[PDB]
mmCIF file of all heavy atoms in Angstrom:
data_model
loop_
_atom_site.group_PDB
_atom_site.id
_atom_site.type_symbol
_atom_site.label_atom_id
_atom_site.label_comp_id
_atom_site.label_asym_id
_atom_site.label_seq_id
_atom_site.Cartn_x
_atom_site.Cartn_y
_atom_site.Cartn_z
ATOM 1 N N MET A 2 13.493 28.544 -37.861
ATOM 2 C CA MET A 2 12.554 28.856 -36.746
ATOM 3 C C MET A 2 11.837 27.642 -36.086
ATOM 4 O O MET A 2 10.861 27.114 -36.833
ATOM 5 C CB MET A 2 11.520 29.928 -37.109
ATOM 6 C CG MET A 2 10.967 30.669 -35.983
ATOM 7 S SD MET A 2 9.562 31.825 -36.234
ATOM 8 C CE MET A 2 10.140 32.681 -37.745
ATOM 9 N N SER A 12 29.583 21.933 -23.092
ATOM 10 C CA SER A 12 29.791 22.431 -21.567
ATOM 11 C C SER A 12 31.200 22.246 -21.068
ATOM 12 O O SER A 12 31.562 22.853 -20.148
ATOM 13 C CB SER A 12 28.759 21.670 -20.652
ATOM 14 O OG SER A 12 28.992 20.219 -20.784
ATOM 15 N N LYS A 13 31.930 21.238 -21.709
ATOM 16 C CA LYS A 13 33.375 21.068 -21.438
ATOM 17 C C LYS A 13 34.261 21.750 -22.437
ATOM 18 O O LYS A 13 35.544 21.541 -22.329
ATOM 19 C CB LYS A 13 33.588 19.604 -21.415
ATOM 20 C CG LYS A 13 32.755 18.853 -20.170
ATOM 21 C CD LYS A 13 33.074 17.401 -20.252
ATOM 22 N N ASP A 14 33.846 22.530 -23.291
ATOM 23 C CA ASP A 14 34.648 23.208 -24.274
ATOM 24 C C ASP A 14 35.753 24.086 -23.664
ATOM 25 O O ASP A 14 36.942 24.090 -24.117
ATOM 26 C CB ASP A 14 33.885 23.865 -25.404
ATOM 27 C CG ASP A 14 33.029 22.913 -26.391
ATOM 28 O OD1 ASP A 14 33.281 21.767 -26.220
ATOM 29 O OD2 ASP A 14 32.558 23.450 -27.231
ATOM 30 N N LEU A 15 35.414 24.943 -22.675
ATOM 31 C CA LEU A 15 36.168 25.857 -22.057
ATOM 32 C C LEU A 15 37.352 25.164 -21.425
ATOM 33 O O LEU A 15 38.550 25.456 -21.692
ATOM 34 C CB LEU A 15 35.372 26.751 -21.067
ATOM 35 C CG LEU A 15 36.247 27.943 -20.421
ATOM 36 C CD1 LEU A 15 36.801 28.908 -21.291
ATOM 37 C CD2 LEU A 15 35.112 28.641 -19.435
ATOM 38 N N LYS A 51 48.753 42.353 -39.685
ATOM 39 C CA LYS A 51 47.663 43.212 -39.371
ATOM 40 C C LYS A 51 47.012 42.820 -38.033
ATOM 41 O O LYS A 51 46.468 43.590 -37.407
ATOM 42 C CB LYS A 51 46.613 43.144 -40.521
ATOM 43 C CG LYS A 51 47.223 43.611 -41.926
ATOM 44 C CD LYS A 51 47.888 44.828 -41.911
ATOM 45 C CE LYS A 51 48.611 45.153 -43.263
ATOM 46 N NZ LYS A 51 48.994 46.651 -43.242
ATOM 47 N N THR A 73 36.134 30.202 -32.557
ATOM 48 C CA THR A 73 36.793 31.464 -32.470
ATOM 49 C C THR A 73 38.119 31.209 -31.822
ATOM 50 O O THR A 73 39.067 31.847 -32.004
ATOM 51 C CB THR A 73 35.885 32.542 -31.774
ATOM 52 O OG1 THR A 73 35.636 31.970 -30.435
ATOM 53 C CG2 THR A 73 34.658 32.832 -32.416
ATOM 54 N N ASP A 77 42.110 32.075 -33.598
ATOM 55 C CA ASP A 77 43.241 32.620 -32.966
ATOM 56 C C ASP A 77 44.542 31.897 -32.878
ATOM 57 O O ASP A 77 45.587 32.458 -33.142
ATOM 58 C CB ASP A 77 42.905 33.129 -31.526
ATOM 59 C CG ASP A 77 42.359 34.735 -31.588
ATOM 60 O OD1 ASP A 77 42.350 35.388 -32.643
ATOM 61 O OD2 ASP A 77 42.042 35.230 -30.434
ATOM 62 N N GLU A 107 46.751 20.813 -34.335
ATOM 63 C CA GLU A 107 45.708 20.304 -35.274
ATOM 64 C C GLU A 107 45.373 18.874 -34.843
ATOM 65 O O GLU A 107 44.150 18.521 -34.854
ATOM 66 C CB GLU A 107 46.047 20.455 -36.608
ATOM 67 C CG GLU A 107 46.062 21.866 -37.149
ATOM 68 C CD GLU A 107 44.723 22.766 -37.156
ATOM 69 O OE1 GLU A 107 43.634 22.307 -36.671
ATOM 70 O OE2 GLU A 107 44.818 23.940 -37.389
ATOM 71 N N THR A 111 41.602 17.719 -33.463
ATOM 72 C CA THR A 111 40.993 16.636 -33.995
ATOM 73 C C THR A 111 40.668 15.487 -33.050
ATOM 74 O O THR A 111 39.552 15.084 -32.874
ATOM 75 C CB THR A 111 41.871 15.956 -35.122
ATOM 76 O OG1 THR A 111 41.809 16.820 -36.235
ATOM 77 C CG2 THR A 111 41.154 14.688 -35.798
#
Side-chain angles (χ1 to χ4, degrees), residues 2 12 14-15 51 73 77 107 111:
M2 208 188 314
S12 58
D14 287 357
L15 186 60
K51 304 308 173 170
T73 59
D77 264 357
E107 291 301 351
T111 292

